Design a protein around this ligand. Structure first.
Ligand code: CDL
Ligand code: CDL
Ligand code: CDL
Ligand code: CDL
Ligand code: PLX
Ligand code: PLX
Ligand code: PEE
Ligand code: PEE
Lengths: 140, 122, 55, 459, 104, 56, 347, 53, 69
């Protein structure tokens, strides 16, 4: 829910990297749980233990991606002394993409994920800076 | 969000309030009406072609009825559209007149007093 | 190397590959009401908490 | 300017009411008359534009483009009637209808006073072109070529639509005169950077910019001859026209957002010129030539100087004429031997001398021999780039040498040597083909005689 | 049948010179082809090309090149005689410009 | 005998008629933008003893 | 089935929809939905076969669940405010359940699985009815409560509908399933602009209904339900294939065709709010619908597929039944963009 | 969407049952008749947005 | 050529003036309409964005078999 989002976003950028990584790991784990729930519903795994294995695999993948993204993003922000710079989010996104590539054992997936997650995270940082709204409230 | 659904004095299924009679009707040579007649003529041609009839010559009464019907509907459509736009402008002007604080007319400045930054192209 | 392979690889071939994979993922359902009614239950529960608990 | 629009709309029922054996004659005669009428648009002013109404206006940048469109229609008609002889009457009329609709959309695009109307027409030009390519092409690659042509264009053009409606909600107008008079600088923020990209990428993909040009060889090779003519001569210039129009509101952000596109244009100019040196298909060579020349035009528009704008206008007109002529020259040999491979039919100067003369003149204008308007545009752009930075001359210099090399390579491979022994079906050149080449080439030199008519509004 | 489909054979191409040794390449019908040649030549070379080039050559000077030249001659004459500078760096009179009060 | 000639070559008047109609419509469009006729600071002029409007 | 009984059932379907549209009481709206469903179930089984029976069963189960949730949301709203009038819906949980129930009725993603299946399992006339008339009541109810709607849920479901419609349509060779995925994407477009302007929702609904009617009537005219059976129509009626090609182009959203108008107006309306990212994604995604419309146009009109010998016998006979409104539907589907400012009469 | 046929023809198809303060049989009152009456009277004719505040 | 095919510069000059006036007024009107729509939807005190409320004429003002309603 938005409680996790607020827990992540309340901490300043280049401070307390361990807490930010923990919040990112929680967000990733929640996303992975939802993904595994939908996957099990639409694609039954033929065995309870197999369903547990698939849930654990998806959840661990997502949690690891989130943890890596948060850790490297915060570390870069505090090392460069440059908060509010999208390049930190780009680095975190590429690190998460390379984590996904290592997790699926595929070089092409790793490279594509690095590029796309880095670009998406940088875009999210730009949106936070400039006030871009994904779901604008009706104004007129 | 519905802007005009509940405007006071609106009659539910009227399509043409009596207030609309105070506006000049569209001219019968209005280019929009001519385009509606063109749409009716195209419908007649397509009707001829689908039924495997000579496209241009098959039914002149049918083509005339098509053009006439499209023009007839378009006239009232244009009247209603113009009425709605007149209503919108009337409401806009009344609201601006009744809320002077939200629409201030500030002092005019000539270009000889406004400092604009110059960006060279080189 | 560039015009026939990599410029092709990055923009149009990647787009085609991704769209085809997602089309295969989305469109390949067995048509069993059990599975996607379970999906409906998951959606309903998520919806109350994710968007409904926050008003 | 309804005195030009209405006669084309009348070309439509004139074609659909003609006898089965007079469609080409009627279409050609009335297309030529419409071109003569459009010739009156060249009487332009020195300070403002001709403001015909609230909807249409004519500048010194769009008048030569309109004249080029109206002049290109009859040439396409003459070039098409050879290979469409076995077609039924209804399908021939539909082909002519597609060409007429394309001309009408192009004529309205170059004179629209608002940016949204310009967008709607510049996007409506897609349907006739796609239909022509995918219906009257020869090989099975035409379907893929149509898909590439469609989606490359739309993926660039839709963000432009979003940006345009946003700009109208912000400033209250999209009318070009109001936009010009009430111009305000763009700050340096991520929102403004993405607005710049949305306003620029559609025109970039139309040119097309190097790395975004893969659709062009497919579409220009797989199309019929009239499709290739109008794709190379007019439809590529939509990007340049739109970019010179839209750059009015992009300052001072362009001062640094132009760097990646400038580097892409110069290096990809070198690359496409080099690609022309090893090409087995004669039409793909002409397509890559178009890419190189358009890269030069992109550079000129991006550096934003009066000399660069003059050079861009002149180069666009000259390239349209030259590339259309080259495509027709290649189509003659294709119709003779039914193959596009360049080294199949050789020594053609022995068999067709006058066609060899036409080949020589076309390839001389391709390499920008002075004092052709090709060279006038190229030299203006080179001078503007040199003022921008003295190191561009090296890249520009390399391009000039390479262009000459591949142009004369094409000429020597096709015309000189010894004729292939097994090919015995090379009939003499028809009067129609010679008239087509003459009507391509004579206006080029006539325009050289009076070059201020193609130098744009910055003159 | 060891075939896949019923199809017409690919036909040989027709030579317009066979039935018309002077064929002009416009149509198979000699009369229509001759008149197509005639209308193309007359309306392309005789009408649009030559007459249009003459019209463009004799277009009136709406670009105001000669007017500008004469105006500049008048201005140079007046400024040279009076001892005034030929040209001024500022194109706008500073009396109508109001700079900001403070620069500190 | 002109019946067949007319029925074979009546498609030759569509384009000139469209041209003259476009000229007429352009004149009509110009007729609706005279709000500043003889009113600009650069071209404001006293009327001649006979003429009514400075341009049409 | 007796023609009199069929006409009575059709009028009962329309009576339920009109009762939904004219009522002021939540109970009467629920009754209208019940009556509409009760009359609609037999129309889906008019041509009896196992596939039609399966389609009817799936439709009944989905719609009965949706109406149960609808009634529960009404009762919760009554509990927290003793109001039966259809208004701003004073309770948020009730509004969430109401939104989910109406989305289930419309077939918006995540609850979009039933639409391809029911459309493929019934006849083309039943599909025409299901994909045109059955959208009116839930959309009208959504329009009447648009102020209390939560944008985050509605916009999420709309974007999911556009994405899933495009992706699912990419994979189909059956024409009814293609139509169903197209319907899903257009429903997404309709519901994306609902919290901002209901006039745009109505305009998009009308244009979509016109294009869908034209497409279904063209498909009924040339009795094709698969891509390969539609590939034969050129050798029997080429005019039908040409008109279908132009209508398919219009459905794609290419200017200057009428299909482009709703997307254009919705993008403008969303940029009148802040809302920049969402229209950009929506257009980029509608490119997928354009892709599979273009593939259908390639297969049926722009190339000629091989035919069979027995088509010669069909050449000798004409179409007996004639659809009187098909030419007007085609013209309205294609050549209506210049009349865009007439949408002001919709509000 | 909503076609106010009842308002146009003056029919009262279902408005009689919408609120608790509207003409019950034998004049039996709702438990919260006065509160609903006051809320309705206070919010009548000012529109939904103004009324909520 | 000038006498036969073209007019003087003043015609184009003043037509441009008229066009510019019309377009500027339209732009100002568009901006003003957007602002008015924003204010009306925010405050709900204008003719636009009026949402239905229960009719007061539905209330029965009769003795209710109990003195306290
Ligand atoms: C940034 C913050 C968070 C962002 C959230 C949004 C992003 C979502 C990302 C998730 C992507 C899901 C789809 C891609 C995966 C592909 C499917 C798959 O199983 O392959 C797995 C693949 C390997 O498995 P595989 O077995 O090899 O797959 C081969 C088969 O072909 C694959 O199996 P298959 O082909 O046989 O099919 C399996 C099945 C599986 O079906 C699915 O997976 C369903 C997809 C839904 C996932 C979306 C949930 C996210 C919601 C987040 C909400 C907030 C959370 C807090 O697919 C289908 O059936 C498709 C049918 C389509 C029906 C759609 C119904 C879904 C409902 C709509 C979406 C959700 C609605 C929510 C509420 C709606 C109310 C209006 O790789 C993985 O394991 C990855 C799994 C999860 C990774 C997610 C990454 C998360 C990163 C977070 C970092 C945090 C950063 C810090 C924040 C600050
Ligand atoms: C006001 C609005 C709200 C309304 C809603 C609220 C309602 C609340 C009231 C609830 C009161 C209960 C009333 C009874 C309901 C009727 C149930 C029923 O009839 O069962 C039919 C259904 C099918 O009947 P059947 O055909 O006779 O039996 C077929 C065999 O059972 C299976 O045959 P098979 O061996 O061939 O299949 C393999 C096996 C394999 O099964 C599996 O693979 C499941 C293993 C998943 C691992 C669990 C995750 C572990 C960690 C997650 C912990 C989350 C928090 C912690 C965070 C991380 C910690 C580090 O089963 C399946 O694949 C079928 C799918 C069943 C999965 C459960 C579906 C629920 C949603 C999907 C969850 C997916 C899990 C992913 C993670 C999601 C969060 C937990 O039976 C079942 O599916 C299992 C029995 C369920 C009964 C108890 C569960 C009720 C849950 C109610 C709500 C909670
Ligand atoms: C418009 C004009 C034109 C533009 C468009 C055209 C040009 C751009 C597109 C074309 C090139 C882009 C392609 C990217 C790589 C594609 C990978 C791929 O296709 O995977 C599927 C494909 C399928 O593989 P699979 O099915 O998963 O398994 C079978 C494997 O093949 C079996 O694998 P294996 O057993 O043979 O060994 C694989 C192993 C070992 O590979 C080998 O066996 C041989 C050793 C090769 C490794 C090279 C690393 C050491 C040399 C680097 C020296 C310096 C770099 C140059 C810069 C100099 C600066 C002055 O590689 C690794 O373990 C990877 C670990 C990471 C080390 C390499 C990555 C370095 C990142 C570059 C940093 C650049 C930052 C910016 C710098 C700015 C200053 C200029 O993967 C491969 O087979 C290729 C493996 C190697 C890929 C990494 C090479 C990196 C190339 C440079 C990337 C820069 C471009 C992207 C920049 C944007 C990103 C944010
Ligand atoms: C923007 C500015 C204004 C433009 C407006 C928009 C465009 C024009 C209006 C569009 C609608 C009007 C026509 C609708 C009915 C056409 C249906 C048809 O089949 O026509 C055949 C029909 C020939 O049939 P027939 O004469 O009975 O005997 C021959 C057999 O039927 C032999 O027939 P068959 O069936 O055996 O032949 C088979 C053939 C049959 O297939 C077709 O004929 C295709 C026709 C489809 C109709 C178009 C769809 C609906 C309209 C949407 C247009 C969208 C335009 C926007 C841009 C997008 C481009 C698509 O199929 C094929 O060969 C397959 C070829 C594949 C090519 C795919 C391209 C098709 C789409 C192209 C549409 C372009 C616009 C219309 C083109 C003109 C059509 C006549 O054509 C005509 O003769 C009628 C056309 C001329 C009527 C207007 C003349 C007015 C009177 C003259 C005086 C003018 C007054 C001036 C006032 C001043 C005083 C002097
Ligand atoms: C194949 C051909 C395709 C067509 C080519 C299109 C060209 C697009 C390139 C865009 C040009 C510039 C875009 C943004 C302008 C500056 C870029 C940035 O790197 O510069 C620095 C930006 O700093 C860092 O680089 C932050 C950006 C890092 C994240 C961006 C991701 C780049 C990774 C490469 C992905 C490939 C993109 C293209 C996809 C195909 C400047 O520092 P800063 O002053 O702080 O930012 C200026 C903006 N301010 C003033 C509002 C603050
Ligand atoms: C086959 C055998 C060939 C060889 C034999 C040939 C024999 C000799 C004939 C060759 C002529 C030699 C050329 C020498 C130049 C003399 C002509 C020149 O003096 O005229 C120019 C005039 O040339 C014209 O201005 C240029 C022609 C315009 C070209 C437009 C082309 C027509 C439209 C066709 C379609 C358009 C397609 C392209 C779209 C943009 C001068 O311009 P200008 O300095 O002012 O005149 C000053 C006096 N004025 C102003 C009062 C008139
Ligand atoms: C987030 C969502 C973004 C959606 C972006 C979609 C871009 C629109 C293009 C969609 C292309 C879909 C093609 C596809 O998926 O199928 C692969 C297809 C399979 O062929 P079929 O015709 O389906 O099968 C016939 C024989 N069985 O493979 C192909 O060969 C495709 C050929 C044409 C592809 C052309 C695509 C060119 C794209 C240019 C770049 C722009 C892409 C769009 C995004 C731009 C980036 C912002
Ligand atoms: C086939 C190749 C063609 C590819 C072309 C695609 C690239 C197009 C460029 C990006 C288009 C999206 C821009 C959106 C339109 C701009 C309008 C605008 O100005 O909006 C900005 C907001 O700008 C944005 O939101 C844009 C964010 C981007 C969202 C979508 C990302 C698309 C992909 C990004 C990277 C790709 C772009 C470059 C690609 C180069 C070509 C390959 C102002 O909004 P406000 O909120 O009011 O500002 C102040 C108040 N906060």
């Amino acid at each position: 829910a938005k409680t996790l989002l607020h827990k992540y976003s309340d901490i300043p950028e280049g401070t307390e990297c361990h807490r930010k990584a923990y919040a990112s790991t929680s967000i990733g784990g929640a996303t992975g749980l939802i993904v595994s729930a939908y996957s099990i519903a639409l694609k039954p795994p033929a065995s309870f233990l197999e369903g547990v294995a698939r849930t654990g695999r998806y959840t661990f993948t997502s949690a690891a991606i989130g943890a890596i993204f948060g850790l490297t993003s915060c570390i870069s922000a505090q090392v460069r002394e440059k908060p509010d710079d999208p390049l930190n989010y780009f680095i975190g996104g590429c690190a998460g993409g390379l984590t996904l590539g290592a997790r699926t054992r595929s070089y092409g997936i790793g490279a594509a994920a690095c590029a796309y997650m880095g670009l998406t995270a940088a875009l999210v940082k730009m949106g936070q800076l400039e006030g871009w709204q994904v779901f604008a409230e009706p104004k007129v | 969000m519905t802007m005009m659904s509940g405007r006071p004095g609106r009659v539910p299924l009227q399509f043409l309030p009596n207030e609309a009679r105070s506006l000049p009707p569209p001219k019968l040579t209005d280019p929009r009406l001519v385009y509606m007649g063109f749409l009716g003529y195209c419908s007649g041609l397509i009707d001829n072609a689908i039924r495997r009839r000579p496209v241009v010559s098959a039914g002149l009464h049918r083509q005339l009825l098509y053009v006439t019907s499209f023009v007839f509907f378009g006239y009232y459509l244009l009247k209603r559209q113009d009425y709605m736009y007149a209503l919108r402008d009337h409401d806009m002007f009344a609201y601006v007149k009744s809320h002077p604080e939200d629409f201030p007319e500030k002092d005019k400045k000539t270009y000889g007093e406004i400092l604009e930054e110059f960006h060279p192209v080189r | 190397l560039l015009d026939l392979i990599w410029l092709e690889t990055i923009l149009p071939k990647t787009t085609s590959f991704i769209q085809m994979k997602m089309s295969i993922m989305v469109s390949n359902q067995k048509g069993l009401i059990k599975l996607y009614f379970l999906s409906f239950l998951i959606t309903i529960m998520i919806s109350m908490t994710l968007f409904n608990y926050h008003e | 300017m309804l005195k030009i629009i209405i006669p084309t709309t009348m070309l439509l029922p004139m074609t659909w009411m003609s006898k089965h054996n007079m469609i080409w004659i009627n279409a050609t005669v009335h297309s030529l008359l419409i071109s003569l009428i459009s010739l009156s648009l060249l009487n332009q002013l020195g300070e403002n534009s001709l403001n015909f109404s609230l909807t249409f206006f004519s500048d010194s940048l769009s008048a030569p483009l309109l004249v080029l469109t109206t002049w290109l229609l009859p040439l396409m008609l003459m070039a098409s009637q050879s290979h469409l002889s076995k077609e039924t009457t209804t399908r021939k009329k539909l082909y002519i209808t597609m060409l007429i609709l394309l001309q009408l959309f192009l004529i309205m695009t170059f004179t629209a006073t608002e940016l949204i109307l310009f967008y709607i027409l510049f996007e409506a030009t897609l349907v006739p072109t796609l239909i022509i390519i995918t219906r009257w092409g020869n090989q099975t690659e035409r379907l893929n070529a149509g898909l590439y042509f469609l989606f490359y264009t739309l993926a660039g053009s839709l963000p432009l639509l979003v940006a345009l409606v946003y700009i109208q909600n912000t400033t209250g107008s999209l009318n070009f005169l109001i936009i010009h008079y009430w111009s305000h600088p763009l700050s340096n923020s991520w929102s403004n950077i993405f607005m710049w990209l949305a306003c620029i990428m559609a025109f970039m993909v139309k040119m097309p910019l190097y790395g975004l040009h893969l659709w062009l060889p497919k579409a220009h090779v797989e199309a019929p001859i009239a499709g290739s003519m109008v794709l190379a001569a007019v439809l590529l210039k939509l990007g340049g026209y739109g970019m010179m129009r839209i750059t009015t509101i992009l300052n001072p952000l362009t001062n640094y957002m132009a760097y990646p596109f400038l580097m892409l244009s110069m290096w990809g100019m070198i690359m496409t010129s080099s690609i022309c040196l090893r090409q087995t298909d004669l039409k793909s060579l002409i397509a890559y030539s178009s890419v190189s020349h358009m890269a030069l035009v992109i550079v000129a528009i991006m550096i934003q100087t009066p000399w660069s704008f003059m050079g861009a206008t002149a180069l666009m007109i000259a390239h349209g004429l030259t590339s259309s002529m080259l495509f027709c020259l290649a189509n003659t040999n294709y119709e003779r031997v039914h193959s596009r491979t360049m080294i199949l039919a050789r020594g053609l100067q022995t068999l067709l001398p006058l066609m060899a003369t036409w080949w020589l003149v076309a390839s001389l204008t391709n390499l920008a021999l002075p004092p052709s308007i090709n060279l006038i545009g190229e030299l203006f752009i080179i001078t503007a780039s040199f003022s921008w930075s003295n190191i561009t001359i090296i890249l520009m210099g390399m391009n000039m040498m390479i262009t000459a090399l591949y142009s004369l390579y094409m000429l020597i491979t096709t015309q000189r040597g010894k004729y292939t022994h097994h090919i015995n079906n090379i009939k003499p050149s028809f009067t129609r083909e010679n008239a087509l080449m003459a009507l391509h080439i004579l206006p080029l030199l006539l325009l050289t005689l009076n070059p201020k008519m193609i130098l744009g509004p910055l003159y | 049948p060891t075939i896949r489909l019923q199809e017409d054979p690919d036909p040989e191409d027709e030579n317009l010179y066979e039935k018309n040794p002077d064929s002009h390449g416009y149509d198979k019908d000699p009369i229509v082809d001759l008149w197509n040649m005639r209308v193309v030549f007359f309306f392309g070379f005789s009408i649009v090309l030559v007459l249009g080039s003459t019209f463009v050559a004799y277009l009136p000077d709406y670009r105001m090149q000669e007017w500008a030249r004469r105006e500049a001659e008048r201005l140079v004459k007046y400024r040279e005689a009076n001892g005034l500078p030929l040209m001024e760096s500022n194109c706008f009179d500073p009396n109508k410009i109001q700079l900001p009060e403070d620069e500190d | 005998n002109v019946l067949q000639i007319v029925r074979d070559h009546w498609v030759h008047i569509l384009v000139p008629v469209g041209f003259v109609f476009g000229c007429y419509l352009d004149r009509r469009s110009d007729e609706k933008l005279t709000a500043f006729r003889n009113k600009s600071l650069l071209f404001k002029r006293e009327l001649r003893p006979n003429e009514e409007v400075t341009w049409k | 089935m007796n023609p009199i009984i069929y006409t009575t059932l059709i009028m009962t379907v329309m009576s339920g929809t009109m009762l939904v549209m004219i009522s002021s009481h939540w109970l009467l709206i629920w009754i209208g939905f019940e009556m509409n469903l009760l009359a609609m179930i037999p129309v889906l089984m008019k041509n009896f076969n196992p596939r039609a029976t399966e389609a009817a069963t799936k439709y009944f189960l989905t719609q009965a669940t949706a109406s149960m949730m609808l009634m529960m949301a009404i009762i919760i709203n009554l509990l927290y405010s003793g109001q039966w009038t259809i208004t701003k819906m004073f309770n948020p949980v009730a509004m969430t359940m109401m939104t989910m129930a109406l989305a289930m009725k419309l077939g918006l993603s995540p609850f979009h699985f039933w639409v391809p299946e029911v459309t493929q399992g019934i006849s083309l006339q039943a599909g025409l009815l299901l994909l045109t008339w059955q959208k009116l009541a839930p959309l009208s109810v959504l329009c009447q409560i648009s102020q209390s709607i939560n944008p985050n849920l509605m916009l999420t479901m709309a974007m999911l509908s556009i994405l899933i419609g495009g992706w699912g349509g990419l994979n189909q060779t059956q024409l009814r399933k293609i139509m169903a995925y197209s319907s899903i994407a257009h429903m997404g477009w309709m519901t994306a602009v609902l919290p901002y302007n209901t006039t745009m929702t109505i305009l998009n609904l009308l244009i979509y209904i016109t294009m869908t009617l034209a497409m279904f009537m063209l498909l009924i005219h040339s009795s094709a339900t698969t891509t390969l059976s539609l590939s034969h129509t050129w050798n029997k009626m080429p005019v039908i294939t040409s008109l279908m090609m132009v209508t398919l182009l219009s459905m794609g959203g290419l200017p200057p065709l009428s299909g482009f108008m709703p997307k254009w107006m919705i993008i403008q309306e969303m940029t009148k709010n802040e809302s920049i990212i969402m229209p950009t994604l929506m257009a980029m995604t509608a490119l997928l619908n354009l892709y599979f419309y273009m593939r259908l146009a390639y297969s049926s009109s722009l190339t000629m597929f091989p035919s069979t010998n027995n088509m010669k016998m069909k050449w000798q006979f004409e179409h007996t039944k004639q659809m009187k409104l098909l030419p007007t539907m085609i013209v309205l589907s294609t050549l209506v963009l210049p009349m865009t400012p007439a949408l002001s009469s919709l509000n | 969407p909503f076609f106010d046929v009842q308002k146009r023809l003056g029919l009262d198809l279902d408005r009689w049952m919408t609120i608790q303060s509207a003409e019950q049989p034998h004049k039996i009152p709702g438990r919260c008749h006065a509160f609903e009456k006051e809320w309705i009277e206070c919010a009548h004719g000012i529109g939904g947005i103004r009324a909520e505040k | 050529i000038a006498r036969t095919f073209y007019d003087g510069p003043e015609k184009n000059y003043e037509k441009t003036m008229a066009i510019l006036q019309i377009e500027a007024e339209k732009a100002e009107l568009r901006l003003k309409e957007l602002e008015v729509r924003r204010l009306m939807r925010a405050r709900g005190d204008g003719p636009w964005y009026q949402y239905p409320t229960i009719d007061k004429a539905l209330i029965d003002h009769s003795p209710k078999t109990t003195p306290d309603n």
